[PDB]
Enzyme design. Structure first.
Site, PDB file in Angstrom:
ATOM      1  CB  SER A  91     -55.895  29.999  41.357  1.00 24.92           C
ATOM      2  OG  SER A  91     -56.075  29.103  42.442  1.00 24.92           O
ATOM      3  CE  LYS A  97     -53.154  29.666  38.334  1.00 28.13           C
ATOM      4  NZ  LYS A  97     -54.484  29.023  38.143  1.00 28.13           N
ATOM      5  CB  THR A  98     -58.443  29.258  35.684  1.00 30.34           C
ATOM      6  OG1 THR A  98     -57.796  28.164  36.344  1.00 30.34           O
ATOM      7  CG2 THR A  98     -58.493  28.979  34.179  1.00 30.34           C
ATOM      8  N   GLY A  99     -58.897  31.093  37.988  1.00 34.63           N
ATOM      9  CA  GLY A  99     -59.159  31.204  39.409  1.00 34.63           C
ATOM     10  C   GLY A  99     -60.573  30.768  39.746  1.00 34.63           C
TER      11      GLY A  99
END
Ligand code: 6NT
Length: 263
Positions: free
Chosen positions: A43, A207-209
């Site tokens: 993501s 922003k994570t993933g």
């Protein structure tokens, strides 16, 4: 004793492959640990997707207030915001916020459609000087994170450089720049990762993933008090520890970086 060997120890304990890039805009001082190795974005691409949409808004080819209607059939798993609005739709601005702050998969797919697909996002990235990052697939298949697969990957160094260009350069209008920053600052998914290892007075957008093959990522723009911003990209994949421990790896990267930066 060196940050590089601290990260090697930490990477050892994780059982996977750890990539770190730091780009301090106060100085231009870069740091990289596997900075030029490809990692699955998962993501984290949604920060770039939002930037590409804002570029269209600056161009007058898109409006943040435009309402997008969709249905239950459009809903992809993990869509905690869009699932609530099948009946009234959401504006482009609301979809960007959902994609960034909640990693809403359906929001990302609907914005990709407004943009022209993963090929459109890749072309935007090429146009702004990123020759490395590539998006190939949609949600949720871009999260497969198969080792050796170049699809839907970035490098830590390329991601940090692209974040600098978008959040601090001239690519976006000052209004759109601030809006992308504001969305990242409001992120709800990153409390256990980079934020957990940063000084409390730091102002953070991130922003994570998350994906298969033990993949856990976090990218961030960080403003220390009375200091120029710093861009950080951390990618962890092929990990053999559980979800909480993967989060802890990212937090410890932030701790080791700040310590190495201040001494
Ligand atoms: O994450 N960082 O790269 C980073 C480096 C130095 C810092 N000082 N305060 N916060 C910081 C974050």
């Amino acid at each position: 004793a060196a940050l590089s060997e601290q990260l090697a120890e930490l990477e050892k304990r994780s059982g996977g492959r750890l990539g770190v890039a730091v780009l301090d805009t106060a100085t231009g001082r870069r740091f990289g640990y596997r900075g030029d190795e490809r990692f699955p974005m998962c993501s984290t691409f949604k920060a770039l997707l939002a930037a590409a949409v804002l570029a269209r808004v600056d161009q007058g080819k898109e409006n943040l207030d435009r309402r997008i209607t969709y249905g239950k059939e459009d809903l992809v798993d993990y869509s905690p915001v869009t699932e609530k609005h099948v009946g009234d739709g959401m504006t482009v601005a609301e979809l960007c916020e959902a994609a960034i702050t909640y990693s809403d998969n359906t929001a990302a797919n609907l914005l990709l459609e407004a943009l022209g697909g993963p090929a459109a996002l890749t072309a935007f990235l090429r146009s702004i000087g990123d020759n490395v990052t590539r998006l190939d697939r949609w949600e949720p298949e871009l999260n497969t994170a198969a080792p050796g697969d170049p699809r839907d990957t970035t490098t830590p160094a390329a991601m940090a450089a692209t974040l600098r260009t978008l959040l601090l350069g001239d690519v976006l209008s000052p209004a759109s720049r601030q809006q992308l920053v504001d969305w990242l600052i409001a992120n709800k998914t990153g409390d256990k990762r980079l934020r957990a290892g940063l000084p409390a007075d730091d102002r953070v957008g991130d922003k994570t993933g998350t994906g298969e093959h033990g993949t856990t990522n976090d990218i961030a723009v960080i403003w220390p008090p009375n200091r120029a911003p710093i861009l950080v990209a951390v990618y962890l994949t092929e990990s053999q520890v559980d979800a909480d421990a993967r989060d802890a790896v990212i937090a410890e990267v932030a701790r080791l970086v700040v310590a190495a930066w201040h001494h």
